[PDB]
Design a protein around this ligand. Structure first.
Ligand SMILES: *Cc1c(COP(=O)(O)O)cnc(C)c1O
Ligand SMILES: *Cc1c(COP(=O)(O)O)cnc(C)c1O
Ligand SMILES: C[C@H](N)C(=O)CCCCCC(=O)O
Ligand SMILES: C[C@H](N)C(=O)CCCCCC(=O)O
Lengths: 427, 426
């Protein structure tokens, strides 16, 4: 199909995410991706632009990395997929061993699934089944703080920010969960004391606290002091409420630590990972839990964990994930991310002086220009493309989560485009 | 890793589906090619038939050269890009194929990453539809018993609450409306009763959701396609949407391209998955009519706020395009008829077995139903001894073999199935 043909079929038959159909955006045709770069069709002509978004925060080693391509083709040659019901295999074993070794201590059990939203559903199921296994089925609600996002399936939606979150129109049909106020950027003991007070009054009906550690992504690219996670861990411990960290966006080095929990030295009872898990090649996610959680879940009268995605532990997805994680661990990723952060900080600093900019902030390989108004994609997208960068703002944010392989020059091209988008926003 | 090292790691760290940890032992798989798996039995690698098609996905068998090549072709040009703001050739080629081969009127495609997600998307579409019509009270689902629709919490709510796999969770799930178990043979009184029950709930129902013709994970039950014609009629007259979940029945499995085709009926919304990718990669899709898509988009809500990270993944779409074209490029209907005949002929003798209550076949689906639960500890090694990978569940010994299975291979599969049933009764 020609780009023309692709656009026609697309307009007629494809529903895009977070969109209407008809009077929708109008997507740009992508025809190739290599390293940090996408080949897009603009006015009938192919242009090369930097994938500043890492393809929604997944392509940490860039596209078509030789190690990941090879890992995929090697597995393809021997075994594409077998059912995980009754069978196991090397890629599943290798990936699970890697995951339990690099995640916060105590997470020794791995349940694979096909997507981040599903892994969150699995996390909640683990938490609820845990308490059923202890003969306390009243412990069935979740608690979180505002500003959060945990995916788009219906249980996941129930812990999305109920007022400004993308799922706010659904609140009347969602499970009603417990929400603490927005966690602040700077550490304030009074906030943690209030969180504890609120949790204490609901402790008998709470299965778990569920939060994104350090960085809240889709809810506003907000950062908070890691010490709050230390307080959550302690509160949950004392009141016997499970602690769940959703690291689907923060995992695999993105915030400057291997996992954002590591900024706090905290181990949750349950953890979700996804997105950058496969290096952005294929859909895969995982839910990890402690031995105590795993063993209790089938205690009393609860029985087996009745979850089993058809493509659970897919050998192809697991094999590229093994390669992606090994590639990350086999380099000095900590210095790499530090250099990326310094580059983002340096390149975004001029945005602070722009009239429509309210904040500039960087955490690891995350760079954010917060604006005083919602960012118009119709203006932003071509402005970024004109400067050789693929950017997709959302809410009032011009942000990047670039591939780890970006050179300092490429980072400066990305930040330059961001600043120019923000400049255009304010005029 | 060696097989023993894999077993060690697996036992320590891997949670398997529908199981407990440290109380459930998996067999190591080291290769798969065509209709055969290479498994490790007592230290020896053996080749056995994938009678389950790896949970009903591997319709062209494993490592089919056309599908392998499609994947490797796409890998060299573009592994993945975000579907937010971008589009691409594999998504367009796949959407065009699916719109063309599905029941008439299904012209919009929302891709997702798994069957259960595609079901939640379908439900979201149905609820958002009625909101766009100013009827937000229409928010419950109706289905019939014996059904299965996945494992996420909304999907669980339309699993049969009495004896379906999610039955222990009834007290926490959304309470949906359940009609009685639909019978095998057509009885118009069943439809009239379904209508009567639906009528009293019509003002609060967004949709009827069912598996058409074959109910899979809820018990491998078959029903007359005329029931689906009745549901189309009832939904039309009472203004309730009709959703067909064809995640198990799609792509030829029941003898028609989609099971809905047996009834000559189109749902308003349709889910597909599993065999969509030929069993290579996780992918699913939710299709809807122009009416549904436009009504959603014209509502105050506006956008459908759903967007899986790996939505319309190029690699998954590329292998699916190849799998679908490979199916359409051959006489699949004759192939399935031949498979059905082979299954019928090979399972016939099981009818006489003392613990067997029914034998039934529908397209490339063969079922022995027993009078008691089937013990995997007896069934699994028995079948492996006969060169077949079988996974019974509940009281069912069944197969959903790759379409490429030879008559000899089908003979081998059915013989193992008969032998497992024989052992159940002793
Ligand atoms: C397998 C299946 C699903 C869910 O698929 P997963 O990939 O396991 O989420 C949903 N509905 C039906 C009818 C199925 O057979
Ligand atoms: C992206 C994301 C999810 C869910 O991801 P999908 O892959 O879209 O299902 C969940 N939680 C967080 C924090 C995320 O960033
Ligand atoms: C796509 C995935 N579900 C995700 O969490 C990222 C969404 C956050 C950005 C919203 C947008 O780009 O429109
Ligand atoms: C979601 C799951 N893979 C599925 O729907 C098919 C499995 C149903 C059979 C249940 C078993 O084999 O134990």
């Amino acid at each position: 199909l020609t780009p023309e043909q692709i656009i026609a079929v697309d307009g007629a038959h494809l529903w895009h995410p977070y969109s209407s159909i008809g009077r929708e955006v109008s997507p740009v045709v992508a025809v190739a991706a290599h390293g940090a770069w996408l080949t897009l069709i603009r006015d009938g002509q192919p242009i090369e632009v930097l994938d500043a978004m890492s393809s929604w925060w997944t392509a940490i080693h860039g596209h078509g990395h030789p190690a990941l391509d090879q890992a995929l083709t090697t597995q393809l040659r021997v075994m594409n997929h077998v059912m995980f019901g009754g069978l196991t295999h090397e890629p599943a074993a290798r990936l699970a061993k890697l995951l339990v070794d690099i995640t916060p201590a105590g997470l020794d059990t791995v349940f694979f699934s096909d997507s981040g939203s599903v892994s969150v559903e699995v996390a909640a199921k683990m938490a609820l089944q845990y308490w059923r296994g202890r003969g306390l089925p009243g412990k069935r609600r979740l608690m979180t703080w505002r500003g959060g996002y945990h995916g788009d399936t219906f249980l996941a939606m129930s812990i999305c920010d109920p007022h400004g979150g993308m799922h706010s129109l659904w609140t009347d049909v969602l499970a009603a969960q417990v929400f603490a106020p927005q966690v602040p950027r700077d550490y304030d003991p009074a906030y943690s004391a209030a969180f504890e007070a609120q949790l204490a009054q609901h402790a008998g009906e709470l299965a778990a606290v569920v939060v994104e550690p350090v960085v809240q992504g889709a809810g506003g690219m907000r950062f908070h002091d890691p010490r709050y996670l230390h307080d959550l861990r302690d509160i949950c411990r004392r009141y016997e409420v499970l602690l769940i960290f959703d690291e689907i966006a923060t995992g695999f080095g993105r915030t400057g630590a291997l996992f954002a929990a590591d900024h706090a030295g905290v181990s949750p009872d349950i953890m979700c990972v996804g997105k950058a898990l496969t290096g952005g090649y294929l859909s895969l996610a995982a839910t990890l839990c402690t031995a105590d959680v795993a063993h209790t879940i089938s205690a009393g009268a609860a029985g087996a964990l009745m979850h089993g995605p058809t493509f659970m532990a897919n050998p192809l997805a697991c094999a590229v994930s093994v390669a992606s994680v090994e590639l990350l661990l086999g380099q000095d990723w900590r210095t790499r991310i530090t250099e990326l952060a310094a580059g983002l900080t340096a390149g975004l600093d001029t945005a602070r002086a722009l009239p429509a900019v309210t904040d500039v902030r960087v955490c690891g390989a995350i760079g954010v220009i917060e604006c005083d108004r919602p960012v118009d994609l119709a203006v932003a997208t071509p402005a970024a493309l004109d400067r050789g960068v693929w950017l997709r703002p959302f809410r009032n944010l011009v942000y990047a989560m670039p591939p780890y392989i970006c050179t300092p020059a490429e980072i400066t091209q990305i930040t330059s485009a961001m600043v120019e988008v923000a400049r255009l926003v304010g005029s």
